[PDB]
Amino acid sequence: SQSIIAYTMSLGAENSVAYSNNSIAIPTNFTISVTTEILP
Amino acid sequence: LIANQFNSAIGKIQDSLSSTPSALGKLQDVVNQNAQALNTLVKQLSSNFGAISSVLNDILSRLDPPEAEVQIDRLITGRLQSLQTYVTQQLIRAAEIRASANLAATKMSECVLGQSKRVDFCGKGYHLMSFPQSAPHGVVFLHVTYVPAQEKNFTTAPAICHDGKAHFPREGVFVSNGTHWFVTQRNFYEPQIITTDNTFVSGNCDVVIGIVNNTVYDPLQPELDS
Amino acid sequence: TSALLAGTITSGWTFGAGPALQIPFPMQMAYRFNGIGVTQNVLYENQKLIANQFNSAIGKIQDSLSSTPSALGKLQDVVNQNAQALNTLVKQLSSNFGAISSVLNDILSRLDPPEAEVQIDRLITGRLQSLQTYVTQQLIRAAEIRASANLAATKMSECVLGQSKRVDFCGKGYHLMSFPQSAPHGVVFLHVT
Amino acid sequence: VSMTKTSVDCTMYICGDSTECSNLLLQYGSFCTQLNRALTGIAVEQDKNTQEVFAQVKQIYKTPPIKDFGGFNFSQILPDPSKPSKRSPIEDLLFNK
Ligand SMILES: *[C@@H]1O[C@H](CO)[C@@H](O[C@@H]2O[C@H](CO)[C@@H](O)[C@H](O)[C@H]2NC(C)=O)[C@H](O)[C@H]1NC(C)=O
Ligand SMILES: *[C@@H]1O[C@H](CO)[C@@H](O)[C@H](O)[C@H]1NC(C)=O
Ligand SMILES: *[C@@H]1O[C@H](CO)[C@@H](O)[C@H](O)[C@H]1NC(C)=O
Ligand SMILES: *[C@@H]1O[C@H](CO)[C@@H](O)[C@H](O)[C@H]1NC(C)=O
Ligand SMILES: *[C@@H]1O[C@H](CO)[C@@H](O)[C@H](O)[C@H]1NC(C)=O
Ligand SMILES: *[C@@H]1O[C@H](CO)[C@@H](O)[C@H](O)[C@H]1NC(C)=O
Helix, strand or coil, rough: CCCCCCCCCCCCEEEEECCCEEEEEECCEEEEEEEEECCC | HHHHHHHHHHHHHHHHHHHHCCHHHHHHHHHHHHHHHHHHHHEEEEEHCCCCCHHHHHHHHHHCCHHHHHHHHHHHHHHHHHHHHHHHHHHHHHHHHHHHHHHHHHHHHHHHHCCCCCCCCCCCCEECCCCCCCCCCCEEEEEEEEEEECEEEEEEEECEECCCCCEEEECCEECCCCEEEEEEECCCCCEEECCCEEEECCCCCCCCCCEEECCCCCCHHHHCCC | HHHHHHHHHHHHHHHHHCCCCCHHHHHHHHHHHCCCCCCCCCHCCCHHHHHHHHHHHHHHHHHHHHHHHCCCCHHHHHHHHHHHHHHHHHHHHCCCCCCCCCCCCHHHHCCCCHHHHHHHHHHHEEEEEEHHHHHHHHHHHHHHHHHHHHHHHHHHHHCCCCCCCCCHHHHHHHHHHHEEEEEEEEEEEECCC | CCCCCCCCCHHHHHHCCCCCCHHHHCCCCCCCHHHHHHHHHHHHHHHHHHHHHHCCCCCCEECCCCCCCCCCCCCCCCCCCCCCCCHHHHHHHHCCC
């Protein structure tokens, strides 16, 4: 049932932005996300 | 709400550091690299390097000094090569660590001691803060960033044609919820009724490609009437 | 590279700080004008002229890259340095290093093993010195390449994914954008200023 | 952004098909292991360099089918679907040169 699978990697979801000469997308809400960065 | 989000984000960092063991990968890798370099340097003493004995006290006892001198020469050549290799590796690693430490000092200066507008320099998003945390042979930054979440489509136009003259937003974006036109800041949907206070007139309506007819409220006109 | 270009064209800098938010390019370039102290009035008064200048500048980049052969000097130098180091390392096998034979299969045949062992020792000492020299050169070159790659990542982040106010960091002038272009063992930025 | 991702097998380089050379090499110690480890670290570093420069984006974006950008033309930098590899006209001669 479980086995090692070899495949060409996927860079991510193909997100075609709904571009137009009239459409803008101004966010109505945010997120105060804390990112952890480690440096020697 | 923002205070709660900040507290919950810090708590989630706490939990993620507690659970995932590969979080401090950079520091662990640096320590392991130095440790294995030291271990290899120590183990290099057990190699013959062409001498018939890998221990120096036996080659001097079993062999006469006139003949043992060439074996000592082989051993010293091998061990000196090992030391030069170790020192070269140490110097390259120290250059890399110095680059990382200069980057850490820059991040401290520009994010702990200020707010950096450099994109993705301190966290993914519009950077807000940074809280240094000490660590074994390193530092950890809790880059507090502002990330927009809930976007909404809107109809926008570069200018606003009122009274036969173009109107541009002083700061913000002209947007419409289908029928009514509003000016909104660029990072948070806060519709504002269109007014001369937040729009500046900049010529006539013919030049602009994308201008839309609308009205611009005049604050002083109602006080003129009353 | 195409994903970065599409995000830059359609969303602007918003695709590097969260969700990509669509915005017309005549408005994104107005954003970028406001980002250098020039009011967005300027573009909407001169949209056609600025568009033509942008197109002609990209066409001139096309022509200059096509004609001049020494344009990709950094990448060509890196590739040539690596290939030359490899060639030197390979040619080091033909050197005697003090052994009476530069080929290992002849010293073991014409000489008896007890006496051929010292010649094998000379050959291994020479070839090990060659490998250590090659590895040290490769490590220094890799440190330089890592510095260049960190600079390339910084330039991508601050100029493809945003507008950088650092002077002369991305192009000579008040920076507007930057369009990454892939290249053999490197990247090319079209810093619009 | 990256350099050629080469690697050298120390035993093969120093020593050919012969085993006497390998036997004499084992007595020098772990020089060959150190060299191979350094080269592997360089290779992983090149992969990390490429993934750090180009993978800034998290989600692959697509340009809309109609390039109505108010006059601004990007056909030189946007991918060209005609040719087999979807490299832009600038990228084509960047790779050719
Ligand atoms: C913006 O997002 C936050 C959360 O990211 C929302 O706050 C939550 O809203 C839900 C909805 O009822 C509540 O149950 C939660 O208690 C709220 N707080 C948290 C920490 O989740 C907020 O409502 C959103 N704002 C808008 C305008 O939608
Ligand atoms: C905007 O509209 C497009 C298509 O009309 C849609 O794909 C997209 O999800 C919309 N954006 C939002 C935030 O709903
Ligand atoms: C748009 O917003 C205005 C706010 O003044 C409201 O009166 C109107 O009903 C809204 N229309 C739509 C279609 O959302
Ligand atoms: C947007 O493009 C369409 C396509 O023809 C055009 O009809 C319309 O006038 C344009 N609007 C703006 C504001 O550029
Ligand atoms: C805007 O209104 C003016 C007169 O009020 C008219 O001449 C012009 O054609 C209108 N433009 C558009 C795009 O509707
Ligand atoms: C852009 O330039 C190409 C030639 O490179 C041309 O075919 C095309 O019509 C131009 N216009 C746009 C905006 O696509």
